[model samples]
Target: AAQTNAPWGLARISSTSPGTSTYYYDESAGQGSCVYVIDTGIEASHPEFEGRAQMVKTYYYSSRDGNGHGTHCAGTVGSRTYGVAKKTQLFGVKVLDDNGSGQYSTIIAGMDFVASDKNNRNCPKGVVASLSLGGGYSSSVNSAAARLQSSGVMVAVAAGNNNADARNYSPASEPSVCTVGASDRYDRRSSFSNYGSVLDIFGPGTDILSTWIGGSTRSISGTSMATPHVAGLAAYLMTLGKTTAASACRYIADTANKGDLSNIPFGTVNLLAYNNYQA
Candidate 1:
């Protein structure tokens, strides 16, 4: 069955067409999966989370989002209204500060924390870490993300908003990471989105409506916004027994809607993320 009154990003992934008003998803829909938003902290109190979102760890002062970036990303990943996987457990691992800036050390620490958590005896079978932040090439960050994926956590990251080749970015350049670029409602690549061979897939990112700080809703644009949509889909796949990062990544790429996007850069894969809904 299709869910009505959905955000455009949600509706876009579940359907093959470009202008759907509903979202179609499996009944499982990320139940029993865990998705960690590794960015600015998430506003767990936001009603869109439906009590499923929590601030598990933070390198900042407190487990709250002053920048509104992480909360919006979290909503796209698994919020009640705008989520890709509505039932997934959301864990906020705050690495960036209120200003949405953080050192490589702090970001790496957050990655380490997620890896350790994934190995815990009580952790769920499905674990995904959604990273919507990235910068210039950093071997340290790339290595940390690779290690996290090796520890059984599916890692998804942003290609960047620089409109340049993603090869110049850190985790996006990391072959092991699922680097996502941004697309608009018309299935066209966002002008500001980074591209190139490093990108694994593209997701709806322009004027994306999602949960914001202070328990409201807002629209924003970035590859950062696009990354979590793939992360959420990864979590949804995990619920269907795509346990390992490699398998999830393979499924996403293999099943993506190819050649549907316009204005993609040279050498960039023209695959758009799809939820594989069977309706």
Candidate 2:
């Protein structure tokens, strides 16, 4: 379902340029702010992610990435060169294995790392968590999502890659969790992107460029890719001004683009509404 027509968005405050390097250089250059990525552990040493992606701790729960999903997703959000939130810091949590799968309890453990300010106080300052992997409504994190909400940490979860509504999962459907839908590079939702009220918003999910292990690179698609754009953007917006997640999200939702809502089952939205305000 990697449709080429759908548009992709970065979560930074400025959309002056839509490409990853453009946004990172002209718009969201580190600025010394950071965010956490609670997913399978990323290949921290990957060249594109070097110096940019940091380690919160040694996640010994799993040996290595079953697949390259985490590494790829990390590259999209905060990899060294081609990341949308390239300036953002990534904290790896090996919740899943090589099969691109894990349990909720494992996910909770990762969130707990985000919630705790013990070993490293810098994590709490992250402000947002990028979650690009989930199973439909079934991926909802009821209690963990609430804990994150209470801490003022925005948890952006994926709506799923299924060609159905997002109501199928628990955590993704959880009211507090910031459920995300997927859109293509030209403003069209992918045929596989799950849609529903659970999806708080959408981001560029189709035909995305990111990193792979061993210093490799590749392109991928899914609401998974979209979730990071917003998460990365939230960090950028909050850096510009002190605002709640709701307010930041309002800005993104307001500014997003409406590419092809024409006669679709769901409504249309556009983040480009803020294009005029880009600095």
Candidate 3:
């Protein structure tokens, strides 16, 4: 779903400023942070993602992205020039299969693993996860998310692409989850994005450019792409000393760049993405 010639997502995180030739690709962009992307999987060998991304674990199958969706999302979160947090350690947690379908139990297991990945020691700040997949509302997953968040793990789930109320989806409907909707380069809701009270914020998702599966790059368009932006932002906020999930979520919503879109249920009450912040 990716395309060419769009860095709106990168710009949302100060990754495209003057004289910064490396831009988002610079390792120091988010050096002290980490993010776990639960999706089809991430292509660790992708040239742009080298040294930063690794398929740490899996719940459904292997921790490899046969499909390109996970890799694309990971790239936007931390793949050099395309990323929002270039230095964040990108961990790939495969929950969906190559066909892009997964089970609820698998998702719950993945969430648990991320919350306490003793294998990858870092800090008590916990892991920030970007989940772009969705399904019917499930209390189990919702509870899992809540538990993880309470343990310092910040989870950003995508508001589905069904163009309806996001309250109908699982992780999205989870009251405490950082549910995100899709916004295009214009900062307007994407035609296919689901909205409403369940959403936390929006980000550049349409025609987003990021690393692809075969050591290449591509453009994808969906709330899936948008979720990583929020995840990366959550991680960035943590690096700024906002350790608790509550404070990180608060800072993000407080500092968001408000827009004129009036269709979102929360309207201007719900914040939009903005890049101006000090860490």
Candidate 4:
């Protein structure tokens, strides 16, 4: 069988008016296995999301969105592309609000909420936390991410949409994280996507179509728009065979249409297609 790639990854959209739906309605794939979105809140009740997914938990601090970014993002992770694993589970964690802004502490709190609530929520054994928000390079956050990774958690973060090196954020450039950069439908790096040695794989993250708040949608651009595509794709890969976070990431790197690393300025990378040692 031929492998189908849903490169849309994670994205920035709203529940009420998230720009535009990426593709026309089609449920031919049935549904993904399950996935957990740890970012902004989701619109549990919407036209595109009706009976499509559910929210096990949510968190917010002094900010609420009528702007619809979180809802749009969460929808893209699982609601939009049938996720990487059809029948995927959804979790909405609100770190930022209507303004598209959030602090490191709030984001940390959101992560804690998911990890701490695993028992109560019955969170999946191996879950991939998709984060579409973060700063550039930061050593402190890298340590934090390493701790999370050691604890059997793998975080998929956006390298940022600033079009600069990965030196402005925490989780994105964090040393031990799966920092995904933005490529386009043609697999060319987006002009606005951040690139540096600390970056990891690249995926589609620009001018993406996804859900919006209040039942309306449109097309928006940013690394945020593409992050869920990979997250959903990860879920999809797990169902086929290997059902682990490490395996999922390896599956992506192994099958990714290799690009020119030297031609690109993305930070530290040790392997590539046709010349790699261990996957």
Q: How close is candidate 3 to the true structure, as a TM-score?
A: 0.88
**Which candidate number would show the highest lDDT if scored against the true structure?**
1
Off by over 4 Å in 4: 1-33, 55-65, 80-86, 122-125, 136-140, 260-263, 266-279
lDDT of 2 by residue, 134-216 (tens): 65344336677667656767677777888676777646666676777776644566667777665667766777777777778
Provide backbone clash counts, one per model.
0, 33, 7, 62
Q: Which candidate leads the pack in TM-score?
A: 1
Prediction 1 TM-score vs. true: 0.97
TM-score of candidate 4 to 2 decimals: 0.76
Off by over 4 Å in 3: 1-6, 13-28, 118-120, 124-126, 260-270
Window of ten residues with lowest summed lDDT in model 1: 117-126
lDDT against true structure, model 4? 0.56
Q: Over the stretch 1-279, how does candidate 3's per-residue lDDT look in tens digits?
A: 121233767664443222122223233455677788989999999878868999888765477788899999999887866877767889999988988888999988888888888335674444688899888888998888887677677788898899888878888888787888887665567888888877888776777888888888889899998888888877766765654556666567766776534355554244565555443
Ranked by lDDT, the better of candidates 1 and 3 is 1
TM-score of each: 0.97, 0.81, 0.88, 0.76
Itemize residue pairs with steric clashes in candidate 1. none
Which window of 10 residues has the lowest lDDT sum in candidate 3? 16-25
Predicted candidate 4, C-alpha RMSD: 7.0
How far off is residue 228 in model 3, in Å? Answer: 0.3
